[PDB]
Symmetry: D2
Subunit: 324 residues, 4 copies
């Protein structure tokens, strides 16, 4: 997985979900008066509404990525082998990992507000049920200011990092991902000037030789480097449909095609869905491996004063337009 915040005019937040098996994800709106029962925090019977992609178990939305009605977004991405959660402690605010997106989006409106309120927080090892152990996650948090943060709980505790590139993948720890970007500092979209062999006429036989060393791999570092590049150079000052179109193309630059990422014998990680959420307008755009047509759900066309989850299909069949 790969998550980005894109700021051409309005602000768009979303991610590719790359895995070998689905968890019954659907489009889920949680209205203001759905009652969250948090594990080690007071229950919240009135809170912000949110929309995102979630698994639903026992009438509970287990979000993978979502935005709230105030224009804050959070995406959870796998952090296996890097992350660590800690036992509930009395001196802190204990948030279980499976409810971190819900809690943050229920309660806060801005990245700055999240930074302030995380200083006293412990991401606990509580799991949703005996049947569902707590998978290892880290989070991207973004909002309408165009800035994001990275939230990582590891061996040395909870860390909150300013994210100057507005993107996140999987391992390694976020400071290492940032450092590795300097290794690509000579990459350019066009042609470099020849300071490689001064006095020699090199035949620039292809366009874009400046990107010859841009990573194309399916591993976590390669996708992080390439998406940072695609995001940084994407168009600006676009209106709604053009902004959504370019958002999907940025994430397709690091999509995983079936066969390229082998995680067990004939088991492949592939890009199962892509979500694009307009922070200003509360609209979720999406497509999936089997359907390239973009679909859209608008949060504000629903009764946000309600208390029941409002659910829509995510995975769809290829929707071909037959011309003749």
């Amino acid at each position: 997985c790969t998550s980005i915040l894109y700021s051409p005019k309005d602000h768009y937040f979303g991610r590719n979900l790359d895995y070998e098996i689905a968890y019954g994800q659907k489009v889920v709106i949680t209205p203001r008066n759905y009652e969250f029962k948090f594990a080690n925090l007071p229950a919240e019977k009135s809170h912000y509404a949110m929309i995102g992609i979630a698994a639903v178990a026992n009438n509970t939305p287990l979000y993978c990525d979502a935005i709230n009605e105030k224009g804050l977004g959070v995406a959870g991405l796998s952090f296996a082998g890097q992350g660590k959660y800690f036992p509930v402690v009395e001196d802190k605010k204990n948030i279980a990992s499976f409810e971190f997106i819900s809690y943050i989006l229920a309660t806060y409106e801005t990245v700055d507000q999240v930074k302030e309120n995380l200083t006293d927080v412990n991401i606990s090892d509580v799991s949703f049920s005996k049947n569902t152990p707590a998978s290892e996650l880290h989070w991207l948090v973004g909002d309408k200011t165009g800035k994001s943060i990275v939230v990582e709980s590891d061996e040395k505790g909870l860390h909150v990092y300013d994210n100057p590139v507005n993107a996140l993948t999987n391992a390694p720890l976020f400071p290492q991902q940032l450092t590795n970007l300097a290794n690509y500092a000579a990459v350019v979209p066009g042609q470099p000037n020849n300071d490689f062999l001064p006095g020699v006429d090199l035949k620039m036989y292809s366009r874009s030789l400046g990107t010859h060393h841009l990573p194309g791999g399916m591993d976590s570092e390669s996708r992080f480097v390439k998406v940072c590049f695609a995001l940084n150079h994407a168009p600006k000052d676009s209106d709604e449909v053009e902004s959504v179109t370019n958002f999907f193309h940025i994430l397709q630059s690091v999509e995983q095609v079936k066969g390229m990422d082998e995680v067990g014998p004939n088991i492949f990680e592939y890009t199962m869905y892509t979500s694009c959420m307009n922070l200003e307008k509360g609209i979720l755009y999406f497509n999936c491996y089997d359907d390239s047509r973009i679909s859209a759900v608008d949060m504000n066309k629903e009764d946000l004063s309600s208390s029941d989850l409002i659910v829509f299909d995510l995975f769809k069949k290829q929707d071909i337009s037959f011309i003749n």
Copy 2:
């Protein structure tokens, strides 16, 4: 530009068209009785029908990529800086570069047949008009045998290569593209065995560290290596819709996003359209940069015995499916 032949069950031929400016491309069916006026060859008033993406100029289809009713396909890709065209000569069959796709698809059925009949061919320097200079191209030719060839006219004449990877991009010359592939022979889709530092325990901190050196650049060699990999490892034995779906994903593994490939001062090459044609069935599937929904035109639903070009729009606006409209129909 990137062109592939994919053979999961039926066979699919198509390409990404990456460039900075459109040339009025549309979907064009040329029926059997449209009369080709070839520059230096006998006119053909009866021939195989074909479907593909083309510009239309003075009621002449100038194809970018197409397939014919017998299951042959040809795509033209830029070969600028590598190619060479030659003056018309009497000792050869002279095919102008702009008409190569039309001539081959009007006349032949199989790759083997094309290979036999190119032995005496000169790709000529004739252009479509005094005011439309001949763009520099090389071609991928594929068919339902799952095999393909590369046709290249350079400084040493016309060359025809067997294509063991069923893909093609731009420069350099095709043997160089194949040699370069061996530089990536250690790539695997999963995790390698650690013969790098024997005795040392290297934590495999990410999935697919075997692809860590797979190229992701927008340049010609980078796209060639990546698409060869994506095409080789794509699923097999799939039915129609699932095959088409996987075909578009193979080509999206090398798509060009606006901003990533700069070819002039703030001028960008991007993937303007993607085509996918079923050789068995004569169906053209397509999308474009602005519309990710796949569209389809079936050549066999038209009157193939006619003599007029049949045209459909290629470039489309984004076709969003609004789910919770609350129209309450």
Copy 3:
């Protein structure tokens, strides 16, 4: 800038020192009764003897790398932009960065001992003099067990890491260096098996295509990855001269030639000297950019119980063996 511990039979500790400024380095033996006047620790007038490369100022040895008579070695390498030193504090054993090598070698014998005694230590911000500010360093510590540790003082304090690859360069932080190695797990000295494009014959046009992605840059990560590989695959079970010869070849594979590493206008970082120190025997072998002949100084051929520094020249002119001299002796 590149330091290694090499364990073919005997154990060898040493380093390339690559830089653009020289600091008057010489070979320096510190005998057992030289009086160390540490900045914030009691003086030691009797201690282990040691030999290495050092500057000498005000009759004090300021070591860049050295070993002691017990077979412990320490090398200091630039850590600019990553390291942090801290003010002297009462709760801690305060060691100044410029005296870290001297103190460790004067006091301890084994890596395990160093690891046990660093738990309460603070690397202090004290400088040797007003005209000699404390350059930012981190250290490699190795011994005759063939194991090593990395000692780094950064924004989060002092850390001590076991080093499974027995090598060290400059930035970034050592856990990041280790992690980066997994990115090269598919590298092999020979030819990989083709699991890249199964069913395609890839002509292995060159020997050692398994190292096509091995880094050759002058930067810190590139040298770390390549030296780890050369050190891992170097010959074992070898006599003194053959062991020393292979050691120099390992470090030469990551040497910085003048012109390749530009650090200012027409100013270059280059490999000023290479040291190789036999831990069991107390011999230092060295050459330098201007002299490729290897020189040797044996510690145990001096009076190890004196109290004056014993100094020898490090940098030399090229020492060419003229063969067909026709002296007819």
Copy 4:
């Protein structure tokens, strides 16, 4: 395996020889009056004198690399899998592969002369002996003008290329080698300007991040790219000893250490010797895997009017200078 022409002030021509088998090489001077018995050319009893590294068999020098007294140099490097030799033909000047260095250095003075005279040449399949089959080679030719050419006989015949980088390794064909160079056009010895992520502050955590993608592998393309760079940026305007020292450092940067290039089960290609040959002065400097001290043989301190081969040892034991 790697050959260069280096032109700081005087002109230096030489090579690393990297292999897993030795061929009895020695330093060999061939005086003006040694009689060459060429397979299909008239015998030459009077010719230019030369010095180089050669095997000696049946009183015949089989050169690996050498220079002549006029300042012309030739080096033979493996072309296995790429080269082709052809049967003797009446229409051509037929030169056997093992005698190409000998004939060229005996007959010609300049690179331009060699170009003019290769138009009628055919590299023949004639071998030296039943125990010495004709190994597949291609050649670098350089002279004191600071120019060089590449001579390659392949399936399409004999080709002569102008060499803009004054270096050569093994496969592939030379035009492909030059094309591959353009893939490194963004490499610089210092720090690149950040046009990769404009607007983002990339910490340049190490010196020479401009060389992060320079090849360090043992394969033919990797050594070619790196040595071309090391050669191009090496110092200029230097005196004799300074120049020779820099020449050896250039080739050390692409040396093959034992264990990094495996060609058989526990069998390794490694740099067995390095030769450096001053074109103006006729001096051969050399060292070898086992001895890093540099040795020198001056061609002009011998009687060049003689007719017998003058031989010295090449491979030596490590010559350590014990100080105390």
